Amino acid sequence: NPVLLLDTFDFGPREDNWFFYPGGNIGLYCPYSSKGAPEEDSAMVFVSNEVGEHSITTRDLSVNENTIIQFEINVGCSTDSSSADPVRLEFSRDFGATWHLLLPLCYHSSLCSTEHHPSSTYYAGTTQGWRREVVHFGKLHLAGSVRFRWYQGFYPAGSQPVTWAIDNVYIGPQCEEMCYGHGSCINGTKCICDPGYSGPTCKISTKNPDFLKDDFEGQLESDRFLLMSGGKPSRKCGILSSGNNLFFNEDGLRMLVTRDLDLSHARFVQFFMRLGCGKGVPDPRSQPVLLQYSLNGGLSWSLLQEFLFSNSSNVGRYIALEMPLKARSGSTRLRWWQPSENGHFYSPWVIDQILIGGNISGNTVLEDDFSTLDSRKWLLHPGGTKMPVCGSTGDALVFIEKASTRYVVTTDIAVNEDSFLQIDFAASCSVTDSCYAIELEYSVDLGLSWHPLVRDCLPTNVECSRYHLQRILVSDTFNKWTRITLPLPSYTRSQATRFRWHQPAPFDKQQTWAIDNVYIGDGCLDMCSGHGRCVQGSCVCDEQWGGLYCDEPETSLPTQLKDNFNRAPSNQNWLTVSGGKLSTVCGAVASGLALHFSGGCSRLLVTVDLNLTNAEFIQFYFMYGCLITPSNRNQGVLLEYSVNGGITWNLLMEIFYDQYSKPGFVNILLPPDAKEIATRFRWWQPRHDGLDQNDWAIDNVLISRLENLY
Amino acid sequence: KECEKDQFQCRNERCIPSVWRCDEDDDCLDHSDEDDCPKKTCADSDFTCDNGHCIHERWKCDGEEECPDGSDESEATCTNECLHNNGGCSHICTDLKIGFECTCPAGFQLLDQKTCGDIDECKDPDACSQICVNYKGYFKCECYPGYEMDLLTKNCKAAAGKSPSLIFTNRHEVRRIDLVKRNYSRLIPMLKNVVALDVEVATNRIYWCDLSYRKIYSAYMDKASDPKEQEVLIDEQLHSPEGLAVDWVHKHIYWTDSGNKTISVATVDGGRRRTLFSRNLSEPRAIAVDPLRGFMYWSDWGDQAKIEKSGLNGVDRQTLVSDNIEWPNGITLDLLSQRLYWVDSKLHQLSSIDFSGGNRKTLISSTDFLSHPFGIAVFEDKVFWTDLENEAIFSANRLNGLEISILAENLNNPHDIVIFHELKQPRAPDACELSVQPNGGCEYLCLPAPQISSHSPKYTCACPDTMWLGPDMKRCYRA
Ligand SMILES: *[C@@H]1O[C@H](CO)[C@@H](O)[C@H](O)[C@H]1NC(C)=O
Ligand SMILES: *[C@@H]1O[C@H](CO)[C@@H](O)[C@H](O)[C@H]1NC(C)=O
Ligand SMILES: *[C@@H]1O[C@H](CO)[C@@H](O)[C@H](O)[C@H]1NC(C)=O
Ligand SMILES: [Ca+2]
Ligand SMILES: [Ca+2]
Ligand SMILES: [Ca+2]
Ligand SMILES: [Ca+2]
Ligand SMILES: [Ca+2]
Ligand SMILES: [Ca+2]
Ligand SMILES: [Ca+2]
Ligand SMILES: [Ca+2]
């Protein structure tokens, strides 16, 4: 007859609530807390010593759709998950004749609904301490009168099952809004809230994290995961080269629930997952992994993605999933669950590198100088350390340690017509004169596919207006800290483009690199004229450069350049001299010594910025093949000029590979377009067959007007 | 020729990245960077393979290679008597193949020969932050008066009201950092050369010492920046005082001086003064007082490095630490759980010890975060310290040694640091005032005595440096 039920077990057992309890004698179970906050409450305690039946039945009580069963269970008190001797919550509608499980095991493979969840059976090994379980009646098809059982089984003498216990049982009406999932409803009138949560309904609490990451480190206490059921930290069949992962080998419950997170503006959930660890194909009767989300602290769950086992699900795979509108809450938790009817599993599965986050409100800027390694900007960065190096300004992100994987992934940003990319990059700082490059990439599909940012555009191809190699970040030219500024090409435009710096395997530990002062955005103007850095939407001019947009020059720039290559190249004349050195090997190009480009790596010759407003010509001597002749058109040196401090160059001459077999005299009128106040020139060879081959040489350079004559 | 900061110098005069020290690659070419590298034993019950790589015991002996050389899978690795009557075992039993084995569960793991008894958890200092009560098979933490147990976290926090600050010297200024808020302010601007400071919370006074003017000063904090409101306490007979300590109960200042090579005491007004120790002091640095039990503690980094301990009247001097100690130059007390904290600038460590001198614990041993540490402070669950190489103040969890944060940086000379909070300075009775005669009968100084038995003397008198205590034990006799 009665409307509710209630028993704390703290003040003995209570006759009228129960019919009987074979094997449970009031006492103390799983009292421990390593954080010193123990459970001292008394509970029903069905020991593995009591002989015969282990169970507890209630007296018949009247019930409708508002009724909830709320209680604290503890099965086993350890983390060896097992499907042996689970505790079932069954109901009898036939005066205790035959019993049915109160929840069925609903999933796509029954009194079921659309939603997927496990049955009311509680397996051993799911937590250390006491868990709180709550069942609702609204969508069960129950009204009238019924009695309930917590059942474990009939057991012989000498047969030791798992221990279990139960406290704080309540079978009455629900509270106002179900205490928001973070409170123990009492008498249907009173919410007894959970720590951190306040107010009559438990509505008031601190704002949630908007981001989450767990690569899986040895400090696995942290309050990121509400439970890690049947899942262990491991290195077995790692998907990372040699990272640390989470392994689900044991049978029992297999769940993974996050804490409640602020997902109100989240873009993505991403992770690596291998559905089947071994050599052969995992068998087609293995239960799929379901990724779910709760809006209300875990009373009801929606499906994000089902993950089926197959012939091709044998090796690690990167998963990335856009966040649905119906999942963006102030409080939303996600869960990974593998269903099982008996609790036994066939195939084991593994997970690593879980990231949840992103900001879908169309942010168009990402800035950093590396005071902090804000990992909601830099999602991933294996083999990277925050530290100074090579006389970096403050810290850089540095790839220097011994590791078998070196890359760094930005979070997503909106790229448009005015977006540009600017970084400080540096390689080995003279430590090793090896030749290597770092791949700079981009993705518009949350890193499911990475594409090179810049591609080879050479004058052979007539539909190229600017010419440039794909390998921008080479170790000889960027030996010490240098600035790169790229306008962002139209194929990168989107709402959510992310970027990567990748060092492809293999590499030596000694082939190091670093990045500092990253700006990827649409701010400032003119990209600071090439003589600046965008810092918080304002240009920070270079030494000797002023103006709002860094275009007013402070000192006088040289109006003439001249080198006969008698002494090693001066930085008074030359910004960069890569792959070339003084020699007489080339016979006599113009006169005596010449600068000879015969290097294994980059062949680059760039001038300082010059005031060319009243200069007339650029002239030099040139010679090919003092050792080996160039064979392709694409081995021909190009002479370009920049007027934006090296951001975009303009071709002025292709020095064709088939001429200049004998030393020749180049002498060109400067196009009106190059006679600006700050102009530099480069000579570079796009392609060559390595050291000592397809070489060239320059002598008697002179950029100038005609002399006054006396 | 030396190497730059973050390099390691090989024996053949060559510099490599110091992060290539001990990673099993010969980078020097003469194996130098891979000599005397510390070996590896793992966590609690983890198996050490033949090369030192750490795997859980359960992966060992299963046919699969875990260690990079694969040596857990050679034959020098491995080896129901159990359910029936439990077969001699008391609690948790599992049947092994060559013999059975018997282990315990959480809260009681101590076993004589495979029978289990309770863990006494309170035989570890850092089991609870504050109060620890031991039960059978578990334990419970409580809070000292003035502290409330925060139910969301693990920790005993201070009762709500005025929030903790950090006060510290930047050598030419003094700075205050709020802790609940981030309100970062300059408390005194413009000092010449100041490394030592302490505070009297309840009267809101700051005491500091200048090594170049050779004086000890004092001001109220609301007026500390006004040069006129800074009072000179001592202006004679100082060389180089590098440590200060205020006894708030009994109204005395204690200081070290590594120039004169002495330890001294004076009234807060600076009007009456005695040298307490002259002998066996080389480079005395930091000093801290425990006025509730009548003690003072200090450090020195002379050839023989010590943390020493004596009465507040400067009797009963004993050495407290003399092993694994090089350059200890920061010292602080947890008065309630009777625990002392120090930093060592050479050994790069942060350690702790009982007031008695045992239960010694190396909390932090990081050459990255403790390059050249100086000042040290303690409150609730966190330890703070200043570093001179990292130009910063760090925090950390003082129970385990983990959770190392970085509280402020970009600080050129961050020397000494104190927690300004009411609870760091408990109220206590002053016996020189609950006395038959005023000032305990004394003609000059009344110094608190060390309480060794429950009935010790509570105080003792002291005379100027140029005078002797008479036979009445209370008057001063001239020379
Ligand atoms: C998301 O981006 C907007 C700018 O579009 C910004 O105002 C907001 O604070 C951001 N929130 C987070 C959590 O990044
Ligand atoms: C460039 O040269 C001209 C003279 O030909 C001079 O008037 C002008 O100021 C110069 N500007 C710079 C930036 O050197
Ligand atoms: C301490 O040092 C000062 C010199 O700095 C000197 O005048 C004074 O007499 C010394 N006192 C003692 C006790 O050594
Ligand atoms: Ca109870
Ligand atoms: Ca990992
Ligand atoms: Ca920087
Ligand atoms: Ca020449
Ligand atoms: Ca090495
Ligand atoms: Ca193994
Ligand atoms: Ca056996
Ligand atoms: Ca105990």
Side-chain angles (χ1 to χ4, degrees):
Chain A
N1 254 335
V3 185
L4 59 97
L5 183 139
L6 189 65
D7 198 302
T8 68
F9 309 102
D10 301 316
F11 306 136
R14 281 269 318 279
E15 166 80 339
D16 58 320
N17 287 306
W18 324 103
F19 259 112
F20 42 102
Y21 42 81
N25 227 33
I26 189 152
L28 204 67
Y29 194 57
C30 204
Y32 194 91
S33 183
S34 66
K35 307 223 146 158
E39 292 291 312
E40 275 161 310
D41 68 355
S42 273
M44 261 308 126
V45 186
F46 302 77
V47 201
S48 294
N49 289 67
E50 293 261 49
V51 61
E53 201 186 325
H54 283 136
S55 82
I56 176 148
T57 51
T58 56
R59 294 287 172 90
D60 296 65
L61 63 108
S62 63
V63 51
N64 53 78
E65 287 171 68
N66 280 345
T67 317
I68 69 177
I69 309 171
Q70 166 197 294
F71 66 97
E72 286 140 52
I73 185 158
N74 193 309
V75 185
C77 181
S78 93
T79 47
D80 289 306
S81 64
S82 197
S83 55
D85 326 294
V87 175
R88 317 170 149 85
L89 177 62
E90 279 145 356
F91 74 94
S92 220
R93 210 199 297 254
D94 56 15
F95 277 65
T98 46
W99 300 77
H100 331 289
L101 288 178
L102 184 68
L103 284 158
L105 201 182
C106 296
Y107 74 109
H108 263 279
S109 72
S110 65
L111 308 73
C112 276
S113 186
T114 63
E115 301 168 355
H116 319 306
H117 57 78
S119 60
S120 293
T121 50
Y122 305 114
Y123 301 82
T126 297
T127 68
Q128 180 83 338
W130 287 75
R131 188 167 85 264
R132 191 167 84 190
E133 286 290 336
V134 169
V135 197
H136 184 53
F137 272 56
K139 296 182 180 184
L140 272 184
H141 289 89
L142 268 146
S145 193
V146 64
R147 65 166 81 163
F148 308 105
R149 191 170 69 188
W150 280 261
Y151 188 78
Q152 203 213 0
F154 203 85
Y155 296 112
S159 69
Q160 280 205 287
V162 290
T163 308
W164 67 286
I166 163 171
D167 204 287
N168 200 57
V169 184
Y170 171 81
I171 315 172
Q174 61 176 47
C175 282
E176 193 82 40
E177 274 218 60
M178 289 252 265
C179 299
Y180 284 92
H182 325 102
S184 285
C185 180
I186 299 301
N187 281 348
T189 59
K190 182 65 167 68
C191 277
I192 307 291
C193 291
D194 275 320
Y197 303 101
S198 74
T201 48
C202 312
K203 207 186 167 170
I204 321 161
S205 81
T206 171
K207 196 222 164 213
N208 293 284
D210 71 306
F211 178 81
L212 188 157
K213 171 188 176 162
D214 211 320
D215 58 13
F216 291 122
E217 291 319 310
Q219 190 60 34
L220 257 167
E221 183 282 328
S222 66
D223 277 347
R224 280 184 284 261
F225 291 114
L226 284 169
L227 66 89
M228 282 152 68
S229 202
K232 301 282 151 80
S234 184
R235 261 204 300 118
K236 209 183 200 76
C237 64
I239 60 87
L240 265 73
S241 61
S242 55
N244 191 68
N245 68 36
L246 189 72
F247 194 33
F248 296 93
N249 197 20
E250 292 187 301
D251 67 284
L253 191 72
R254 280 184 188 169
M255 201 148 76
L256 196 78
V257 197
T258 73
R259 54 153 301 120
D260 271 275
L261 302 160
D262 180 27
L263 291 187
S264 61
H265 46 254
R267 172 101 61 195
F268 64 84
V269 49
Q270 70 160 64
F271 53 94
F272 268 96
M273 184 190 63
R274 189 180 172 170
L275 290 174
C277 175
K279 52 158 190 162
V281 167
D283 64 329
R285 46 161 164 156
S286 296
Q287 318 88 321
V289 172
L290 278 71
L291 169 55
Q292 289 179 295
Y293 74 92
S294 187
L295 283 208
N296 52 68
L299 308 158
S300 70
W301 296 86
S302 316
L303 185 80
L304 274 189
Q305 194 70 69
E306 191 169 44
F307 290 110
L308 289 76
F309 284 75
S310 53
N311 287 310
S312 61
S313 65
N314 316 262
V315 299
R317 226 177 74 254
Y318 174 78
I319 317 293
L321 302 159
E322 192 182 56
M323 205 79 205
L325 176 59
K326 210 182 186 293
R328 300 199 200 97
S329 265
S331 273
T332 311
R333 53 174 82 174
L334 307 211
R335 82 178 176 181
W336 287 265
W337 167 50
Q338 218 192 349
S340 175
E341 275 132 16
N342 58 341
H344 276 267
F345 292 99
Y346 311 125
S347 305
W349 69 286
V350 81
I351 188 149
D352 199 327
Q353 185 190 322
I354 297 144
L355 278 85
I356 307 149
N359 190 0
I360 71 136
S361 55
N363 178 40
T364 81
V365 178
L366 186 151
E367 219 163 339
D368 218 321
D369 66 343
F370 292 103
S371 331
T372 45
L373 199 44
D374 188 1
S375 60
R376 84 176 63 171
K377 288 194 212 178
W378 307 97
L379 315 164
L380 295 157
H381 59 79
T385 312
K386 196 185 81 61
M387 45 175 288
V389 69
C390 195
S392 42
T393 81
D395 291 9
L397 178 75
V398 186
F399 298 85
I400 183 159
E401 272 176 28
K402 174 178 173 174
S404 58
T405 316
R406 288 176 176 173
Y407 66 97
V408 50
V409 192
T410 81
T411 197
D412 318 292
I413 78 111
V415 180
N416 55 69
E417 285 159 56
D418 289 321
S419 278
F420 65 101
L421 181 149
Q422 188 174 49
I423 54 154
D424 280 308
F425 174 86
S428 75
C429 217
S430 309
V431 172
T432 177
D433 69 325
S434 182
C435 182
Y436 59 101
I438 308 291
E439 274 299 296
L440 172 60
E441 281 146 12
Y442 85 98
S443 188
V444 288
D445 47 297
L446 317 182
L448 297 157
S449 78
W450 291 103
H451 308 266
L453 183 78
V454 158
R455 283 285 224 99
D456 297 330
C457 229
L458 292 159
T460 283
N461 184 331
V462 291
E463 302 129 30
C464 287
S465 47
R466 309 265 156 253
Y467 307 111
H468 42 66
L469 303 179
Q470 151 173 337
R471 283 156 132 245
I472 296 301
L473 306 191
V474 287
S475 63
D476 61 355
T477 305
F478 293 76
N479 181 60
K480 293 140 161 187
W481 288 105
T482 310
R483 188 158 84 242
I484 313 93
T485 312
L486 309 144
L488 281 157
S490 53
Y491 45 110
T492 63
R493 286 161 202 183
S494 95
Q495 264 307 308
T497 306
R498 59 175 68 173
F499 292 90
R500 203 174 78 173
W501 289 258
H502 181 92
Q503 173 164 58
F507 55 82
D508 289 303
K509 176 187 72 177
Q510 314 219 314
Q511 305 181 300
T512 63
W513 51 289
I515 51 149
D516 200 22
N517 315 309
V518 184
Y519 183 88
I520 314 159
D522 53 23
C524 286
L525 185 80
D526 297 284
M527 292 165 303
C528 297
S529 303
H531 310 292
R533 188 166 305 103
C534 203
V535 186
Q536 316 271 336
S538 301
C539 290
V540 177
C541 293
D542 304 57
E543 194 179 310
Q544 314 184 65
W545 280 93
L548 184 50
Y549 306 103
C550 293
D551 62 300
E552 282 156 57
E554 287 177 359
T555 62
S556 279
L557 303 159
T559 53
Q560 178 230 40
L561 199 147
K562 158 164 174 160
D563 207 324
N564 285 29
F565 306 99
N566 283 335
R567 305 184 49 71
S570 167
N571 57 285
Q572 275 282 289
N573 291 319
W574 308 104
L575 260 161
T576 300
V577 172
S578 198
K581 57 173 194 164
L582 306 185
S583 74
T584 38
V585 180
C586 267
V589 177
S591 205
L593 281 173
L595 185 69
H596 176 229
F597 291 88
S598 160
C601 201
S602 302
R603 291 169 193 180
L604 190 43
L605 186 70
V606 202
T607 75
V608 302
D609 296 306
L610 297 133
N611 187 5
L612 289 165
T613 47
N614 293 263
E616 296 158 354
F617 60 73
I618 166 168
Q619 63 184 48
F620 58 101
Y621 289 62
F622 197 99
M623 177 178 171
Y624 276 120
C626 300
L627 313 161
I628 282 100
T629 305
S631 48
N632 311 63
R633 201 216 191 185
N634 283 331
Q635 310 221 316
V637 166
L638 313 170
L639 172 67
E640 291 178 277
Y641 68 96
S642 177
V643 288
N644 59 32
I647 284 171
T648 55
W649 300 84
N650 297 311
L651 182 61
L652 183 85
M653 166 153 200
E654 189 171 343
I655 293 151
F656 303 110
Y657 68 118
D658 59 289
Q659 288 97 344
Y660 308 111
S661 185
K662 282 178 154 68
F665 179 75
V666 190
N667 177 332
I668 297 162
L669 274 178
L670 296 156
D673 221 316
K675 297 166 156 175
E676 315 291 68
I677 50 99
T679 303
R680 64 183 76 175
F681 283 88
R682 69 173 164 159
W683 289 257
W684 70 295
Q685 185 174 32
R687 289 213 185 108
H688 65 84
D689 309 320
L691 175 47
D692 275 303
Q693 297 197 65
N694 320 98
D695 47 281
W696 46 288
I698 196 158
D699 208 323
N700 281 46
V701 186
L702 182 84
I703 306 162
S704 178
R705 53 195 292 196
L706 285 145
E707 280 186 29
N708 280 315
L709 224 62
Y710 311 107
Chain B
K1 183 217 197 84
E2 193 81 19
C3 299
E4 295 176 356
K5 192 205 192 277
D6 277 331
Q7 278 169 316
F8 167 80
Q9 186 153 33
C10 308
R11 274 192 297 261
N12 52 303
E13 284 184 4
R14 268 166 31 91
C15 299
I16 57 157
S18 53
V19 310
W20 292 349
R21 169 93 185 116
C22 296
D23 58 353
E24 300 160 33
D25 281 47
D26 175 23
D27 294 280
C28 294
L29 301 168
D30 65 326
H31 224 83
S32 300
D33 59 293
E34 305 300 322
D35 291 348
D36 296 288
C37 294
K39 284 190 171 65
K40 287 201 165 73
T41 44
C42 320
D44 62 355
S45 60
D46 290 283
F47 178 79
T48 305
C49 299
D50 289 296
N51 57 330
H53 223 80
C54 289
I55 288 93
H56 250 276
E57 200 100 81
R58 62 180 61 252
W59 320 114
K60 181 205 68 182
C61 297
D62 74 302
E64 312 276 327
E65 280 178 350
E66 271 83 37
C67 279
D69 66 333
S71 56
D72 64 303
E73 296 305 322
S74 57
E75 261 87 4
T77 301
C78 319
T79 45
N80 274 217
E81 314 91 79
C82 175
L83 267 169
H84 309 261
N85 325 111
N86 202 339
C89 180
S90 68
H91 301 101
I92 285 182
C93 176
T94 47
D95 193 84
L96 202 150
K97 281 157 73 191
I98 292 180
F100 78 103
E101 92 157 57
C102 170
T103 54
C104 323
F108 39 110
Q109 257 205 307
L110 300 160
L111 55 88
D112 53 24
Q113 173 46 67
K114 286 172 170 175
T115 39
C116 313
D118 168 57
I119 299 279
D120 197 311
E121 281 93 2
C122 319
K123 276 172 192 166
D124 179 78
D126 283 314
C128 297
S129 65
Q130 304 195 352
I131 285 162
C132 177
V133 191
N134 177 56
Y135 297 68
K136 188 179 157 71
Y138 67 99
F139 70 96
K140 187 184 180 174
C141 308
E142 285 181 324
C143 306
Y144 298 129
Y147 292 92
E148 279 166 339
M149 183 66 82
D150 186 58
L151 308 137
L152 180 48
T153 51
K154 182 175 75 64
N155 283 283
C156 285
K157 255 79 167 198
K162 292 158 192 162
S163 52
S165 331
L166 283 182
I167 304 175
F168 69 95
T169 56
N170 206 34
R171 200 98 191 205
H172 66 273
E173 59 190 295
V174 170
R175 277 181 201 177
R176 198 191 207 165
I177 289 175
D178 202 318
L179 288 196
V180 298
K181 330 217 292 162
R182 182 57 187 254
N183 172 2
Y184 187 78
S185 62
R186 171 167 287 108
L187 186 37
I188 322 174
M190 175 117 171
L191 313 196
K192 188 105 154 80
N193 189 353
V194 172
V195 320
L197 86 176
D198 192 19
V199 296
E200 185 169 12
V201 175
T203 74
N204 203 287
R205 289 212 87 112
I206 194 178
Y207 295 93
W208 77 94
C209 172
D210 197 289
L211 308 180
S212 289
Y213 297 144
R214 295 174 164 96
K215 312 203 170 162
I216 302 190
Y217 311 75
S218 173
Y220 300 105
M221 273 146 190
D222 53 83
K223 287 166 166 293
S225 55
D226 178 33
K228 294 165 151 65
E229 280 270 336
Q230 312 173 354
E231 320 158 339
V232 178
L233 297 191
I234 306 285
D235 59 328
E236 279 152 326
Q237 224 44 230
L238 297 161
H239 193 320
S240 280
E242 299 187 333
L244 273 177
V246 170
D247 178 350
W248 63 92
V249 182
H250 313 94
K251 311 288 170 178
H252 298 299
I253 42 156
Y254 292 76
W255 73 100
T256 79
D257 184 323
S258 60
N260 280 166
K261 300 273 187 294
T262 52
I263 294 185
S264 310
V265 72
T267 44
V268 160
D269 47 34
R272 293 175 183 179
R273 174 186 174 172
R274 171 161 203 76
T275 308
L276 299 166
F277 290 106
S278 318
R279 300 176 307 197
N280 313 145
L281 294 161
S282 178
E283 307 301 331
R285 175 60 56 79
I287 192 172
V289 310
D290 166 23
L292 322 159
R293 304 173 192 87
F295 290 102
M296 61 171 177
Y297 306 75
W298 68 94
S299 64
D300 77 324
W301 52 282
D303 278 336
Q304 319 299 317
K306 321 161 198 168
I307 297 147
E308 293 183 279
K309 172 190 193 195
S310 96
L312 279 170
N313 59 10
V315 314
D316 206 52
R317 179 176 166 188
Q318 73 216 245
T319 297
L320 208 61
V321 188
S322 54
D323 306 317
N324 311 322
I325 192 173
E326 280 313 293
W327 207 303
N329 76 340
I331 186 192
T332 289
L333 312 161
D334 193 287
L335 292 179
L336 285 146
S337 50
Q338 279 169 71
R339 195 107 178 125
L340 183 156
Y341 291 101
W342 56 286
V343 298
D344 201 314
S345 284
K346 206 67 172 73
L347 289 156
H348 304 283
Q349 285 172 334
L350 195 153
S351 317
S352 68
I353 211 157
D354 265 354
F355 279 14
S356 61
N359 287 358
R360 194 193 149 161
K361 205 186 272 184
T362 307
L363 267 55
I364 298 171
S365 204
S366 166
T367 64
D368 282 45
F369 300 119
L370 301 167
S371 304
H372 201 274
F374 194 83
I376 190 180
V378 155
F379 198 44
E380 286 156 357
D381 62 312
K382 296 224 164 295
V383 57
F384 312 81
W385 76 93
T386 54
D387 197 281
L388 284 200
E389 269 283 66
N390 301 311
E391 288 197 26
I393 315 164
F394 294 86
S395 88
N397 186 279
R398 75 196 190 98
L399 309 148
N400 51 41
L402 313 170
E403 298 155 42
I404 298 181
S405 195
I406 178 153
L407 202 137
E409 50 188 303
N410 186 47
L411 291 159
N412 203 15
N413 303 283
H415 283 275
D416 209 5
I417 193 163
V418 291
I419 293 275
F420 182 94
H421 189 260
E422 214 205 31
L423 284 190
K424 274 288 269 210
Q425 292 181 352
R427 279 86 219 167
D430 182 350
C432 300
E433 283 176 6
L434 307 191
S435 195
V436 178
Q437 288 298 314
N439 209 28
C442 313
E443 191 213 291
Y444 201 64
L445 291 166
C446 194
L447 303 190
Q451 292 310 305
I452 289 141
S453 67
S454 74
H455 182 69
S456 291
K458 278 128 205 150
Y459 62 91
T460 80
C461 309
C463 277
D465 278 320
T466 53
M467 285 174 94
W468 321 294
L469 201 54
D472 63 352
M473 288 297 208
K474 288 187 186 299
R475 184 193 271 95
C476 282
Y477 285 76
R478 207 37 141 180

